[PDB]
Write a protein that binds this ligand. Sequence first.
Ligand SMILES: N[C@@H](Cc1nsnc1O)C(=O)O
Ligand SMILES: N[C@@H](Cc1nsnc1O)C(=O)O
Ligand SMILES: [Cl-]
Ligand code: NA
Ligand SMILES: [Zn+2]
Ligand SMILES: [Zn+2]
Lengths: 259, 259
Amino acid sequence: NKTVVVTTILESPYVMMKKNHEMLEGNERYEGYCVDLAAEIAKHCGFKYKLTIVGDGKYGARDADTKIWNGMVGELVYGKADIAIAPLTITLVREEVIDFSKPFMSLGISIMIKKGTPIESAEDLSKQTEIAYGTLDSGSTKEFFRRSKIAVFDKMWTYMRSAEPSVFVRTTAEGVARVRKSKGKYAYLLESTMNEYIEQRKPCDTMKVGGNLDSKGYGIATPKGSSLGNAVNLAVLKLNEQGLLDKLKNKWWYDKGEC
Amino acid sequence: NKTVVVTTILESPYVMMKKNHEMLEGNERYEGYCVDLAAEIAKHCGFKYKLTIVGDGKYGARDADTKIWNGMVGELVYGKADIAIAPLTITLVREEVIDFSKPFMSLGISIMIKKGTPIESAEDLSKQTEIAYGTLDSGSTKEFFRRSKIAVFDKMWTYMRSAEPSVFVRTTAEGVARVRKSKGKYAYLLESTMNEYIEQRKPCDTMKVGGNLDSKGYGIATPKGSSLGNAVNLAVLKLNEQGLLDKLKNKWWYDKGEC
Ligand SMILES: N[C@@H](Cc1nsnc1O)C(=O)O
Ligand SMILES: N[C@@H](Cc1nsnc1O)C(=O)O
Ligand SMILES: [Cl-]
Ligand code: NA
Ligand SMILES: [Zn+2]
Ligand SMILES: [Zn+2]
């Protein structure tokens, strides 16, 4: 009968600081796709909640040496949060330590280029060197390449892990900025959802090119064995069938379009 | 320990009888995406299985009066099958009575028209009468239109439910044949997966038009509480991350392509 601690991450357009946040308190300080989703899930599940941005600003990965989980996954694993409502990718290694609802959004790894870049696919990136390319420093995308057995992807990984300086970035915003200021000499591998979002934001100079490299989804996560998981899983399905999710995506992705 | 009874359905290209099937026995009589998926899953979960075609040839719905489930879901809820490996859509009503693995395939409801039919969208079908349209007699698609609040879809449901003669079909093949021999006076609403497949088969006279009406996925189902569920779910995720599911999709949809 207590307030649910929701761990989430500052990633546009999922969770963003409201323009006048410093004059607001609690949940009213945030806005975005996941903020709207959180209010809906909590309303349909009947619980009070509190949104908290993940301290280290990470999604979640296990450190090879210490074996400790960081990011939003870590907050769930070590009991700091009761639930995670964010663009957290459903992956095998995560599913082994936390529970995931059925996906509320479908997506895939994609390529983000500065308009004009002579690249139309991952294959293209692999068969050249002039243009550098990387992914987020930790998360499902980097893990995807590091584990792939498909020649093209494995080849891109061989290059990325040894590239110097590092082609990996700490945050999505860091990757987008790097694409924008690299005169077309840097491409960024990120999930199609974020790629499509950025493509509709000023200065409208980036572009999603080629098809997705894979298919997967984002799910609402809870600690392994949490009682909350069952209800939340059922709420996601109901909200999807009633069109809420489609409406929310259009709202934050296209209605707000700047291009 | 014991051979796992797999319930499935004859739906191309998921499960199909091989050409020389009469000379074969057991699982060897079948071929297809789901047949391969089944083998893979059984290999990684370590068990023997028997493929059985669902008796009433239905996906699964609950009779409003008797409250009895039919089709594959019915076989699972009543203990006739241990698992269902087929293109069974993850939904709220089904999730309430059976367990679903994370989706092994993403899809949406789509429109199939005979080439040349003057229809580009759902809205187009709703604003006219000359062209009849309907869905599978029972399944997630028919349910979607019945539980739809969206004006366009709702309007389509009113027409379909009252239409005469009936526009609903017992099987997808029947829906497809109806479109093909109706001079374009009938459009069939079915899942994008089947639509895309048919679009690539002779006589090559059908088309998937417009975008998907919704987003959802297929999941491997198991009786609620089943022990096999956990391992199967982790296996689906493993196969997706290794690229196998993408491989099978290309193999059965486009490598086989005839148009
Ligand atoms: N959604 C990913 C992080 C991410 N966002 S864009 N590229 C990425 O890797 C994760 O949940 O780890
Ligand atoms: N996959 C659906 C049936 C179906 N296949 S193509 N159009 C449809 O409605 C179900 O699982 O009920
Ligand atoms: Cl046997
Ligand atoms: Na109505
Ligand atoms: Zn395998
Ligand atoms: Zn009845």
